[PDB]
């Protein structure tokens, strides 16, 4: 869809027997990262990770650096509080993750806001879709919920998500127009790997596409085959494009019985293709 | 731009 999203991802990892936790933040527009912050650096600062964000003046970088530093010390507070809620000891390392941001439509208007938290990898507490209420995972999360409700944090978050989030996302989308409004279709092709004197592997490749969302399907005689198929996770090529492939094991001949189907944005119509041998 | 908040849990 012609929609867009912006997302920040915070990871705080406590360090027992030592000092401040490690705090890292990254920001994405859709599947394109554009900023980062790492408390471990010598003098930590928000840093650009995309061309179209370097245009921002130093007020931007100073403000965001200060935001990340304050968040890091606060996350330290949150980590020792949560350790208290669960009666865990001082010896272990623990992780607090935050992810938040906004999905907007082609019109630039807001479709959905998000702000949720995980503790040691598990859903801890999340702002509901109405941007006015919370869903807690357990009773500890309800301690946190009473704190967030008393401080009316949901209204602050709704202000940010309906305000700065969408406005700055529209600014980013306009400034990185070429790189963010693009949809690179996948360059696609099928390969053949004989594993026996009758068995073989039929692998369908999608390379160089953007964004990461894609669906590959194997169809035996034009009929959904999902049996002894291998489907690897979508993976980054490192040049801001993505790669994926799916494989099916196939007996003797009858390779032409099988078809791979590729659904992706940048494609005008879905793609059907078979092993074209030589 | 990140949220100009330091929420605590």
């Amino acid at each position, epitope marked *: 869809g012609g929609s867009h999203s912006m997302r920040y991802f915070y990871t705080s990892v406590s360090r027992p027997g030592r000092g401040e936790p490690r705090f890292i933040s990254v920001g994405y527009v859709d599947d394109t990262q554009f900023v980062r912050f790492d408390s471990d650096a010598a003098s930590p600062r928000e840093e650009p990770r995309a061309p179209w964000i370097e245009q921002e003046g130093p007020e931007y970088w100073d403000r965001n650096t200060q935001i990340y530093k304050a968040q890091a010390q606060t996350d330290r507070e949150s980590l020792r509080n949560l350790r208290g809620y669960y009666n865990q000891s001082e010896a272990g390392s623990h992780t607090l993750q935050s992810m938040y941001g906004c999905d907007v439509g082609p019109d630039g208007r807001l479709l959905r806001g998000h702000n949720q938290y995980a503790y040691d990898g598990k859903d801890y507490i999340a702002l509901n879709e109405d941007l006015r209420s919370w869903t807690a995972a357990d009773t500890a999360a309800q301690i946190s919920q009473r704190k967030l409700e008393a401080a009316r944090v949901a209204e*602050q978050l709704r202000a940010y998500l309906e305000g700065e989030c969408v406005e700055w996302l529209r600014r980013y989308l306009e400034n990185g127009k070429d790189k963010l409004e693009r949809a690179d279709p996948p360059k696609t092709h099928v390969t053949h790997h004989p594993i026996s004197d009758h068995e073989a592997t039929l692998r369908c490749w999608a390379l160089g596409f953007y964004p990461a969302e894609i669906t590959l399907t194997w169809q035996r005689d034009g009929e959904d085959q999902t049996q002894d198929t291998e489907l690897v996770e979508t993976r980054p090529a490192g040049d801001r494009t993505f790669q994926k492939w799916t494989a099916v094991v196939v007996p003797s001949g009858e390779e032409q019985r099988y078809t791979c189907h590729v659904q992706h944005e940048g494609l005008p119509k879905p793609l059907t293709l078979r092993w074209e041998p030589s | 731009t990140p949220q100009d*908040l*330091n929420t605590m849990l």
Partner: T-cell receptor
Amino acid sequence: AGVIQSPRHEVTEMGQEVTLRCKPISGHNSLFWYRQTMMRGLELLIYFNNNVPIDDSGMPEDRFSAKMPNASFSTLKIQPSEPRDSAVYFCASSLGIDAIYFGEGSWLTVVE
Amino acid sequence: DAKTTQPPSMDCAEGRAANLPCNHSTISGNEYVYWYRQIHSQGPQYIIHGLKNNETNEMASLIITEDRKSSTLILPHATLRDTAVYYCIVRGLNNAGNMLTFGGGTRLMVKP
């Protein structure tokens, strides 16, 4: 109770260390130190939120130090006091985005 | 930063309504209008605040225009205890704007 501040009055010779203490309203997570003089009226010295110093741009560049060791106690200290430090120092707190409430202040006259 | 402007002084007759104007033409959508007052050698005292809708409480009523660019604090029946300096303050919903920045205010004198 409201914001608790002490000392309410302090008359002390220059060159001493001055310590002003504040207890925010129970459960409030934000705390502000303000200075009030004739020349400039009320001026923000420092703003803490959830025990973390957010804005200390108003703090004098020397001799002034503000701390918040726990959610229910904060100090403003003036390392060697000087007569120009004379003013009323107000502590305020708030619970999230509810209203900010002010203490009764510490009236400091640093005397030559 | 201060975004409000007020008349430096204003007089009101005891038992009459006091209409205290305030301009804030650059106010943002995530910014509330607060009104505080300070007597003499006392800490500022919260009066009232609002976003878009007009608001009332035991002390005052607050009228915010449709375009939000100005507002009026209304003391419906001034008493002698209402003589004070009245501050109109914008307060935003994030850390850049969560503190109060005090301007000149309006010195209101209630005439018996």
